[PDB]
Amino acid sequence: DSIQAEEWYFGKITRRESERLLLNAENPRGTFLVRESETTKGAYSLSVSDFDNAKGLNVKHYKIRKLDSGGFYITSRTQFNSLQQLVAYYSKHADGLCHRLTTVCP
Amino acid sequence: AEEWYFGKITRRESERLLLNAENPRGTFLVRESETTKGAYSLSVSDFDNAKGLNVKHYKIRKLDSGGFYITSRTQFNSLQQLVAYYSKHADGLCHRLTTVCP
């Protein structure tokens, strides 16, 4: 389906594999990718690269839950009718995330 | 940085992960201890006839001078040396640390 081919969706890659792709030093902070959650059925995960001078480059993982209406959310502040709309939103506003989403993981 | 370090995932999460594949015995990861500050926890899959596949958890204590241990037999000056040692020598663990959790 459409989601399978989104440039930012990485399907069933593991959290460890997403950190392997995201921790690459070429990536600016806020490089991200969406994937299925490995440990929660039916949820997704937004993994975001970030940096601090103590953990080094690191990745933060945010569960994305799906509501019975069909929407999605990470926080109580905002919900979205699609992952596409969630990504578009957090590309414009961190709003609790470690960083605004900037580069789509290559 | 290490591919086997899974950071703050939980005990339950590690068990979901370590058991969630066609993962052999001896698949493992290291994570921050939930129960004890400063320590880590080594989680390793195992198989036995009564339990079937199951996960064992081993505290990794941190010494004041900097090193780490799980038993009195050997201690390590870093956490990576611990992992490297137990990949070659089970020494009391259920199995050697052979496959990093995918």
Q: Tally the domains of chain B.
A: 1
Q: Provide the 8-state DSSP code for A7.
A: T
Nearest CA distance, A58 vs chain B (angstrom): 8
B-contacting residues in A 78-97 (Cβ below 8 Å) = none
> What is the secondary structure of A40-94 as a DSSP string?
STT-EEEEEEEEETTTEEEEEEEEEEEPTTS-EESSSS--BSSHHHHHHHHHH--
Q: What is the CATH number of the domain that holds B62?
A: 3.30.505.10
CB B93 within 8 A of CB B44: yes
Closest-CA residue of A relative to B10 is: A39
Spell out the residues 6+ positions from residue B56 whose beta carbon is closer than 8 angstroms to its own: B43, B44, B46, B93, B94
Deposited resolution, Å: 2.0
Question: Solved by what technique?
Answer: X-ray
CB of B102 within 8 Å of a chain A CB? The answer is yes
Spell out the residues 6+ positions from residue A24 whose beta carbon is closer than 8 angstroms to its own: none
Nearest CA distance, B73 vs chain A (angstrom): 31
Give the 3-state secondary structure of B79-94: HHHHHHHHHHCCCCCC
Closest-CA residue of B relative to A39 is: B16
Domain coverage including residue B62: 1-102
